[PDB]
Amino acid sequence: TSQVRQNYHQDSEAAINRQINLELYASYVYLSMSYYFDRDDVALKNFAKYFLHQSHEEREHAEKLMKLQNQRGGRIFLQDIQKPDEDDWESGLNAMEAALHLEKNVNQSLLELHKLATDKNDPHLADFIETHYLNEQVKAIKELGDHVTNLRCMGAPESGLAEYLFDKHTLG
Amino acid sequence: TSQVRQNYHQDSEAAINRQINLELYASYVYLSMSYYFDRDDVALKNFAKYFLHQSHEEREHAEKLMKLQNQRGGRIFLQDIQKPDEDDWESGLNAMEAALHLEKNVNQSLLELHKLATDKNDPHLADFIETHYLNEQVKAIKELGDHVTNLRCMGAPESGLAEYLFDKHTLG
Amino acid sequence: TSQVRQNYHQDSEAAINRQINLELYASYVYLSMSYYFDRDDVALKNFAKYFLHQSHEEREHAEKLMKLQNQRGGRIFLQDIQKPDEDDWESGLNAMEAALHLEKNVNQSLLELHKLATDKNDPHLADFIETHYLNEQVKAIKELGDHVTNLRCMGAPESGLAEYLFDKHTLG
Amino acid sequence: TSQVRQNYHQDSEAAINRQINLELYASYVYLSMSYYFDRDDVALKNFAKYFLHQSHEEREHAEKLMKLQNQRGGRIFLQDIQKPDEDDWESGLNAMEAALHLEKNVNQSLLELHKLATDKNDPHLADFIETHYLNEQVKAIKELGDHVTNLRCMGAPESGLAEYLFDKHTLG
Numbered sequence: 111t112s113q114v115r116q117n118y119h120q121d122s123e124a125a126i127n128r129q130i131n132l133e134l135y136a137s138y139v140y141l142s143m144s145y146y147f148d149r150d151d152v153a154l155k156n157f158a159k160y161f162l163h164q165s166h167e168e169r170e171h172a173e174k175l176m177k178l179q180n181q182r183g184g185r186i187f188l189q190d191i192q193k194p195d196e197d198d199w200e201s202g203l204n205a206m207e208a209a210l211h212l213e214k215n216v217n218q219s220l221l222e223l224h225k226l227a228t229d230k231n232d233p234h235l236a237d238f239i240e241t242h243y244l245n246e247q248v249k250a251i252k253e254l255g256d257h258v259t260n261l262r263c264m265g266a267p268e269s270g271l272a273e274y275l276f277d278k279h280t281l282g
Numbered sequence: 283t284s285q286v287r288q289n290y291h292q293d294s295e296a297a298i299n300r301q302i303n304l305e306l307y308a309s310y311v312y313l314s315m316s317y318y319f320d321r322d323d324v325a326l327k328n329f330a331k332y333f334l335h336q337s338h339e340e341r342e343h344a345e346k347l348m349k350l351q352n353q354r355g356g357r358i359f360l361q362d363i364q365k366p367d368e369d370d371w372e373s374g375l376n377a378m379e380a381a382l383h384l385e386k387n388v389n390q391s392l393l394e395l396h397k398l399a400t401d402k403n404d405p406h407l408a409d410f411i412e413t414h415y416l417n418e419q420v421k422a423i424k425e426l427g428d429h430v431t432n433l434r435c436m437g438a439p440e441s442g443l444a445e446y447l448f449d450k451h452t453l454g
Numbered sequence: 455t456s457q458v459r460q461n462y463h464q465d466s467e468a469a470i471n472r473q474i475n476l477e478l479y480a481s482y483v484y485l486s487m488s489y490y491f492d493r494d495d496v497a498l499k500n501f502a503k504y505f506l507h508q509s510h511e512e513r514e515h516a517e518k519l520m521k522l523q524n525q526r527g528g529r530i531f532l533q534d535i536q537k538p539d540e541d542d543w544e545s546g547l548n549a550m551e552a553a554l555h556l557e558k559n560v561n562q563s564l565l566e567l568h569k570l571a572t573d574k575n576d577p578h579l580a581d582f583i584e585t586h587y588l589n590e591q592v593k594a595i596k597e598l599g600d601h602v603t604n605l606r607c608m609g610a611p612e613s614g615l616a617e618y619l620f621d622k623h624t625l626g
Numbered sequence: 627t628s629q630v631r632q633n634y635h636q637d638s639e640a641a642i643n644r645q646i647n648l649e650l651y652a653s654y655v656y657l658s659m660s661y662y663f664d665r666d667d668v669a670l671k672n673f674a675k676y677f678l679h680q681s682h683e684e685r686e687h688a689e690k691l692m693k694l695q696n697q698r699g700g701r702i703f704l705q706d707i708q709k710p711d712e713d714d715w716e717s718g719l720n721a722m723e724a725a726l727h728l729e730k731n732v733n734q735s736l737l738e739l740h741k742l743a744t745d746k747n748d749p750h751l752a753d754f755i756e757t758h759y760l761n762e763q764v765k766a767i768k769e770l771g772d773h774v775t776n777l778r779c780m781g782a783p784e785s786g787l788a789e790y791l792f793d794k795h796t797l798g
């Protein structure tokens with residue numbers, strides 16, 4: 111149907127649409143986390159900044175997947191963006207752990223998208239996933255794990271002083 | 283009860299949560315339009331840029347309303363962002379017309395929020411709506427109307443030459 | 455009658471005079487708190503700086519209300535500035551809590567001034583209150599609530615280590 | 627017998643020589659199109675410049691492939707660069723269509739080279755093809771499609787004005 115489409119399986123196009131939805135959902139979760147930390151009864155402003163930045167970055171990765179869909183002659187098909195599963199994120203340690211899990215899920219779905227690209231012999235799609243998503247997911251997961259470890263060693267969440275100082279020193 | 287809450291009725295808290303979801307919906311619609319215009323068989327780069335900037339601006343307003351919710355002692359409650367009821371926006375003129383109607387609906391809902399706010403003797407929320415949304419939406423609807431009028435006067439949608447030149451001279 | 459007076463009822467003139475005295479009272483309380491934190495047996499320099507700046511800001515608002523009184527054709531009538539009902543503010547957390555309540559009271563009195571202003575069909579005074587006081591007091595109360603929340607979460611007032619570090623990392 | 631040769635299959639060597647020829651040919655086609663638009667009876671200056679830049683870039687791609695052949699220890703075997711199919715390219719839209727077809731063909735043989743390379747477990751050759759050729763081809767095809775779409779929507783080739791305005795706005 112598209113004059114530019116070449117070597118671009120319809121499974122790959124649907125999988126790209128689903129991945130776009132996933133990146134937008136991650137962006138939504140991060141947004142809710144961020145403004146949770148903006149509440150006057152939490153007031154961890156750098157946690158808020160950190161999560162809001164990650165939310166904009168997930169939105170950027172969704173926009174790049176939409177660009178990629180148009181680049182391949184695919185056609186973008188958007189779904190509802192589900193609300194996050196929680197509205198109260200308990201603590202900075204618990205937010206960081208939910209984000210760790212969220213990035214692990216996103217990575218796993220990216221790895222399935224890669225294996226689909228490879229078994230459909232679409233090396234452009236495989237290398238796009240590699241170059242723009244795979245190492246970024248690994249760096250994100252490593253950094254979240256670092257934060258989780260530090261918060262836990264400092265005595266979070268029972269130690270609110272721990273979360274305050276982490277907000278000041280690591281997220282500052 | 284919040285330690286900062288003062289003169290913030292529950293109706294306006296809920297209407298703010300609804301307005302947050304509405305502004306997130308608006309940016310979703312603009313994002314869909316933007317990448318429709320990035321398709322290989324549409325290829326109007328400045329229409330795409332225009333709607334992507336509108337998208338980001340709507341997201342910034344949603345975040346501003348979240349900030350106000352937290353500022354007022356309210357609780358942010360996020361619901362699903364409904365997918366745009368359209369996939370193919372047909373043309374630049376039709377996209378501008380749909381944006382005009384979207385913004386008009388957002389505007390009347392903002393006025394209903396303001397009417398509720400002044401009904402409940404909450405002058406900070408009313409002036410906030412005024413200050414940060416009312417004239418912004420008026421200018422936005424006026425701009426979109428100008429865009430619609432120009433594209434129509436130029437021969438859109440029958441002549442793709444009109445849409446091409448509007449994309450270059452106005453959206454450029 | 456003034457040569458410039460127009461649509462300035464006597465109730466709002468008197469309420470402006472009362473608000474002038476209230477804002478002078480607020481700055482007096484902040485000044486007392488500031489130098490409490492300068493005592494040799496308290497010695498939290500940035501708490502002191504913070505409350506002295508709040509004091510000067512309240513004095514600037516009192517002077518702004520005086521300027522508005524003169525602008526509207528009214529007569530400034532000054533009454534005694536009542537001494538703060540406390541000498542010893544006990545701790546940084548308790549000082550922040552007292553400031554939170556002070557500002558909350560000032561805010562509801564500002565809303566009563568606005569309600570009177572819109573009762574009397576005086577839209578300039580109402581928008582002036584909005585513009586120059588309503589969102590300022592909202593931001594102030596939110597900031598003080600954040601401060602209270604952090605100091606509490608950090609272990610104040612039991613651990614003077616929390617107050618020391620808050621003084622360094624947040625008020626610094 | 628190359629002292630540097632390692633994991634470089636004789637089929638990979640030959641396929642690289644064929645790709646070198648194909649890129650020099652793409653360069654020749656672009657050169658012929660560019661000087662067709664420099665004709666006094668066509669005289670579309672920016673079409674000319676665009677296709678000259680495409681020709682210089684295609685020959686840089688050829689030289690990168692020759693350098694790759696040497697890095698891997700294979701041997702450059704060059705062949706005739708065939709003259710293009712057409713001397714007269716008819717119009718700007720027809721030229722853009724021929725360019726789109728030509729680049730889709732270059733892309734198909736690049737994908738075949740990647741399949742060969744991964745069939746021979748030559749991951750260096752694969753990743754080289756990926757990062758220096760495959761996304762550049764995907765972007766080139768997307769861009770030519772966009773151009774064709776605009777020429778068509780504007781009413782080319784029947785409207786000489788459409789191609790004039792496209793020359794001035796998109797290509798200038």
Ligand SMILES: [Ca+2]
Nearest residue numbers: 237240753756
């Ligand atoms: Ca790769």
Ligand SMILES: [Ca+2]
Nearest residue numbers: 367368369370
């Ligand atoms: Ca429809």
Ligand SMILES: [Ca+2]
Nearest residue numbers: 539540541542
């Ligand atoms: Ca006492």
Ligand SMILES: [Ca+2]
Nearest residue numbers: 706707708709
């Ligand atoms: Ca020949």
Ligand SMILES: [Ca+2]
Nearest residue numbers: 237752753756
């Ligand atoms: Ca690879």
Ligand SMILES: [Ca+2]
Nearest residue numbers: 679765766769
């Ligand atoms: Ca280019």
Ligand SMILES: [Fe+3]
Nearest residue numbers: 133168171216
């Ligand atoms: Fe991501």
Ligand SMILES: [Fe+3]
Nearest residue numbers: 213216247250
């Ligand atoms: Fe991510």
Ligand SMILES: [Fe+3]
Nearest residue numbers: 305340343388
């Ligand atoms: Fe808006």
Ligand SMILES: [Fe+3]
Nearest residue numbers: 385388419422
């Ligand atoms: Fe808007």
Ligand SMILES: [Fe+3]
Nearest residue numbers: 477512515560
């Ligand atoms: Fe004040």
Ligand SMILES: [Fe+3]
Nearest residue numbers: 557560591594
């Ligand atoms: Fe104040």
Ligand SMILES: [Fe+3]
Nearest residue numbers: 649684687732
């Ligand atoms: Fe090439």
Ligand SMILES: [Fe+3]
Nearest residue numbers: 729762763766
């Ligand atoms: Fe090329």
